[PDB]
Amino acid sequence: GGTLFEVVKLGKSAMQSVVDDWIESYKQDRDIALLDLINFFIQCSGCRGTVRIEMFRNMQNAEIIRKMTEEFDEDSGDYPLTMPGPQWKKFRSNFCEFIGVLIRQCQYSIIYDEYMMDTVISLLTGLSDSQVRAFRHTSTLAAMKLMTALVNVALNLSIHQDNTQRQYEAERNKANERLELLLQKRKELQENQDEIENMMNSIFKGIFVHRYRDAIAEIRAICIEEIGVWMKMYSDAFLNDSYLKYVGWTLHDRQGEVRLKCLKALQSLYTNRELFPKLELFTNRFKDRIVSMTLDKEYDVAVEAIRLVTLILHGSEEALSNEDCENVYHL
Amino acid sequence: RKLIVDSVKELDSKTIRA
Numbered sequence: 057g058g059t060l061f062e063v064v065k066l067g068k069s070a071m072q073s074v075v076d077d078w079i080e081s082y083k084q085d086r087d088i089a090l091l092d093l094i095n096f097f098i099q100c101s102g103c104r105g106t107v108r109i110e111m112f113r114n115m116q117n118a119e120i121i122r123k124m125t126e127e128f129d130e131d132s133g134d135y136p137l138t139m140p141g142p143q144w145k146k147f148r149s150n151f152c153e154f155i156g157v158l159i160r161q162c163q164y165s166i167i168y169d170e171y172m173m174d175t176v177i178s179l180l181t182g183l184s185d186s187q188v189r190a191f192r193h194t195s196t197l198a199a200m201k202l203m204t205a206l207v208n209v210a211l212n213l214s215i216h217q218d219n220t221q222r223q224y225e226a227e228r229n230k231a232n233e234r235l236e237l238l239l240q241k242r243k244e245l246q247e248n249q250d251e252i253e254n255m256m257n258s259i260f261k262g263i264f265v266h267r268y269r270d271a272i273a274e275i276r277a278i279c280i281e282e283i284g285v286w287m288k289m290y291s292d293a294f295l296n297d298s299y300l301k302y303v304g305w306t307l308h309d310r311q312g313e314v315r316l317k318c319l320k321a322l323q324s325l326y327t328n329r330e331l332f333p334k335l336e337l338f339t340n341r342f343k344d345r346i347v348s349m350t351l352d353k354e355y356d357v358a359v360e361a362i363r364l365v366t367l368i369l370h371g372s373e374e375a376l377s378n379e380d381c382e383n384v385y386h387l
Numbered sequence: 388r389k390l391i392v393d394s395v396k397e398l399d400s401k402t403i404r405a
Contacts, residue, residue, distance in 0.1 A: 189391040192396065271397060308403075
């Protein structure tokens with residue numbers, strides 16, 4: 057038998073096989089599986105200690121992490137997410153795929169049992185508050201991929217909410233048994249949405265708003281890259297000023313890798329002219345910074361800024377030609 | 388001790404003036 061961390065690092069079986077094998081143990085004994093998942097995030101950070109079942113039942117995440125820094129048993133500053141080579145690069149990919157597939161497989165029952173998600177989010181939040189860069193880096197990446205997976209759960213719920221509403225109207229156009237059943241299912245799917253958004257809110261207010269301004273460049277880059285993913289995949293909920301402000305504030309970052317994450321996050325939004333009204337205030341506010349980054353001392357940052365400024369110019373009122381609108385509306 | 392430990396975890400407001 058191999059630990060949950062050692063299976064993902066090896067990457068022999070598909071991540072879904074590891075996820076399904078864990079879910080089966082969760083249905084056999086919730087505490088044993090959660091202890092394995094807790095140790096998975098601990099050991100993915102390079103820590104070689106092991107959370108005992110007695111600690112998981114009697115300690116808070118605060119004391120548990122303090123004990124695991126004692127038992128880290130390292131020989132250098134390295135931890136898996138900073139290890140060179142394509143081997144640990146596939147680990148990072150497998151580590152992220154495991155988090156996404158886990159929530160994808162749990163999204164229809166287990167995610168709502170008020171035990172797994174509360175345990176996982178509390179652990180990642182505590183690890184994101186630790187001064188140990190290995191714990192803070194690993195959990196921040198895990199929380200960002202966890203949020204994206206939860207966004208996908210919210211998109212499925214909305215699709216399901218609309219179809220349940222369509223089914224309710226189809227039945228109503230004929231109360232009886234099926235009409236009561238469809239109403240309760242609508243009420244159920246609405247309560248699911250409030251739980252998923254409560255989890256996403258816990259991750260954002262508890263981890264993101266602190267780690268986006270982390271002292272380490274790649275931790276800021278991890279947060280900026282994922283908030284751009286959320287705004288692209290769920291623009292109706294995430295593409296607004298209260299979320300864009302974090303990307304705009306980070307445009308002035310001292311590290312080019314972080315400024316590049318900001319520009320690439322904005323670029324995928326500005327390629328869709330249907331999102332320009334949602335970006336108008338942001339464009340007006342950060343216009344001067346974005347054009348100034350076109351001559352950034354980092355080549356990749358400047359190229360992306362020129363690419364971004366080109367989209368902004370092409371979607372403005374100045375790019376609207378008279379002869380073309382006369383051409384479309386002739387005769 | 389070789390474990391990387393960051394005393395200050397976040398960028399302070401006195402340096403977000405960029």
